[PDB]
From Swiss-Prot, chains A, C:
Belongs to the tropomyosin family. Homodimer. Heterodimer of an alpha (TPM1, TPM3 or TPM4) and a beta (TPM2) chain. Interacts with HRG (via the HRR domain); the interaction contributes to the antiangiogenic properties of the histidine/proline-rich region (HRR) of HRG. Interacts (via N-terminus) with LMOD2 (via N-terminus) and TMOD1 (via N-terminus). This is Tropomyosin alpha-1 chain. Detected in primary breast cancer tissues but undetectable in normal breast tissues in Sudanese patients. Isoform 1 is expressed in adult and fetal skeletal muscle and cardiac tissues, with higher expression levels in the cardiac tissues. Isoform 10 is expressed in adult and fetal cardiac tissues, but not in skeletal muscle. It is linked to Cardiomyopathy, familial hypertrophic, 3: A hereditary heart disorder characterized by ventricular hypertrophy, which is usually asymmetric and often involves the interventricular septum. The symptoms include dyspnea, syncope, collapse, palpitations, and chest pain. They can be readily provoked by exercise. The disorder has inter- and intrafamilial variability ranging from benign to malignant forms with high risk of cardiac failure and sudden cardiac death. The gene is TPM1. The chain holds residues 45 to 114 of 284 of the full protein. It is found in: Cytoplasm, Cytoskeleton. The molecule is in a coiled coil structure that is formed by 2 polypeptide chains. The sequence exhibits a prominent seven-residues periodicity. Binds to actin filaments in muscle and non-muscle cells. Plays a central role, in association with the troponin complex, in the calcium dependent regulation of vertebrate striated muscle contraction. Smooth muscle contraction is regulated by interaction with caldesmon. In non-muscle cells is implicated in stabilizing cytoskeleton actin filaments. The lineage of its organism: Eukaryota, Metazoa, Chordata, Craniata, Vertebrata. The modification Phosphoserine is found at residue 1. It comes from the Eukaryota.
Length: 70, 371, 70
């Protein structure tokens, strides 16, 4: 009767509480991963310009050397 | 007055008013019919369901695509799709709105002839025009040169354009598209133990492909990694629960684009077709074409596609050359944006096909200078 | 007598279900952000490797130019 439904509702509530805790744990892990990736991309995208200017002046004095050789 | 830009495409109709930033109405180009009998009396369900409506009743209906590869097979359902687009999604009478349509390269002339005849007779639009998808895509990007690869759901074509001058002899068309990729995914998922047969489940497989698939920069290394690591497997939830998992098939499906031999096609991969098309052009314009490679179409939305394409083309092209690939975020809507821009030009107002001009010149006028 | 208990149980179940639904919605948001960030960082890491090879060969043929100029 109503007792069976009440017990089932309580037990289901317990499983959903466990799932809620698992969800919070997974989101904490996801946020940690997201901030780590943010730091990594910050490093990469603040070194990309250095690499770009590096290859830029590399081909610059490459061209200068080639024309002088010619 | 105002102009109306409609793109039938294949598998996704997108329509709107000219001058808008994005299409107003976007919905699958699907017509479905009920294959069961139905016992309730007074429900009064209509015979056919068109557009996104048919998507919501997928389980009871059977779906038919009026477009197989660019061309139109069934016309009555195509007329139904056009009527639904004009009257329900836009709620505008086409009796006073010029219509611009998009049409893929290298298709039967009868297709254009019947399209114009239907539009001029059934709907009596004051005027209409037909344009190539590649040119519109180039318009949207703001470029004026460069080779454009448009990969939709029906057909994938490369069209090189330089200084606004197209090169018809270098246009390359290949029938590999998103629908074939979905079919290959359906065929390959049977290996893991999941079987999809009903046309309804084709949509589920398409959603899986859209939301889960990705392109691998290198194939053999990724296969080796997947053979040992389990960090690639991902889980998807079907409409009725019953979560499934997918591993290698995550990146095997898109590889068909670079490896047509998977599905038995003789032709070469899209990268090789692009390189061959570039080489087919002259020698004084290859610099810009290499440096202004443009991508468009829904199938191009695979993450990592640009890197693989650049790597392949660089491996093919000479090292001295600079290879750049343009991948705007709004690839799949580029064609409609280009069409909207084109329809809004002042100089385009005299290039429409008028009603009485159509009547006196006959349906074939579409193939005259009013291309 | 048990009617109040059932009403309280129903209210608690509703509150827990709402909190759980928020937990999911937020978890899906975080997971989507994390996946997008991971894809972007991987793509730009591939860019990093290819530009690194470009720079390496840049110094290579720059050195070649240097001696040939010598
Ligand atoms: N993000 C995505 N991932 C995978 N496939 C996609 C994605 N976006 C669109 N597609 C594919 O693109 C197709 C739609 O192409 P679309 O841009 O409508 O061109 P057309 O209308 O000419 O077919 C769909 O069949 C779909 O499978
Ligand atoms: Mg298209």
């Amino acid at each position: 009767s109503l007792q069976k439904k009440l017990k089932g509702t309580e037990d289901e509530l317990d499983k959903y509480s466990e799932a809620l805790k698992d969800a919070q744990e997974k989101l904490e892990l996801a946020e940690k991963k997201a901030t780590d990736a943010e730091a990594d991309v910050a490093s990469l995208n603040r070194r990309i310009q250095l690499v770009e200017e590096e290859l830029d002046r590399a081909q610059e004095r490459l061209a200068t050397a080639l024309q002088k050789l010619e | 007055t105002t102009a109306l830009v409609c793109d039938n495409g294949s598998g996704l109709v997108k329509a709107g008013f000219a001058g808008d930033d994005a299409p107003r109405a976007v919905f699958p180009s699907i017509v479905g019919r009920p294959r069961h009998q139905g016992v309730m009396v007074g429900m009064g369900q209509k015979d056919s369901y068109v557009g996104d409506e048919a998507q919501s009743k997928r389980g009871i209906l059977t779906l038919k695509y009026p477009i197989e590869h660019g061309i139109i097979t069934n016309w009555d359902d195509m007329e139904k799709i056009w009527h639904h687009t004009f009257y329900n999604e836009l709620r505008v009478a086409p009796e006073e709105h010029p219509t611009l349509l998009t049409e893929a390269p290298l298709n039967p002339k009868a297709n254009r002839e019947k399209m114009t005849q239907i539009m001029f007779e059934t709907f009596n639009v004051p005027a209409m025009y037909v344009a190539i998808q590649a040119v519109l895509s180039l318009y949207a990007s703001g470029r004026t040169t460069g080779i454009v690869l448009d990969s939709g759901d029906g057909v994938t074509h490369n069209v090189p354009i330089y200084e606004g001058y197209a090169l018809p002899h270098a246009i390359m068309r290949l029938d590999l598209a998103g629908r074939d990729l979905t079919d290959y995914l359906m065929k390959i998922l049977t290996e893991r133990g999941y079987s999809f047969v009903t046309t309804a489940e084709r949509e589920i497989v398409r959603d899986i492909k859209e939301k889960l698939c990705y392109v691998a920069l290198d194939f053999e290394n990724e296969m080796a990694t997947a053979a040992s690591s389990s960090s690639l497997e991902k889980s998807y939830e079907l409409p009725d629960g019953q979560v499934i998992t997918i591993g290698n098939e995550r990146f095997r499906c898109p590889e068909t684009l670079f490896q047509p031999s998977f599905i038995g096609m003789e032709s070469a991969g899209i990268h090789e077709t692009t390189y061959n098309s570039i080489m087919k052009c002259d020698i004084d314009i290859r610099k810009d074409l290499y440096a202004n490679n443009v991508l468009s179409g829904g199938t191009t939305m695979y993450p990592g596609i640009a890197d693989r394409m650049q790597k392949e083309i660089t491996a093919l092209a000479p090292s001295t050359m600079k290879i750049k690939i343009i991948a705007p975020p709004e690839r799949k809507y580029s064609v409609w944006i280009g069409g909207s821009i084109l329809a809004s030009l002042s100089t385009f107002q005299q290039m429409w096909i008028s009603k009485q001009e159509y009547d006196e010149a006959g349906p074939s006028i579409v193939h005259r200078k009013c291309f």
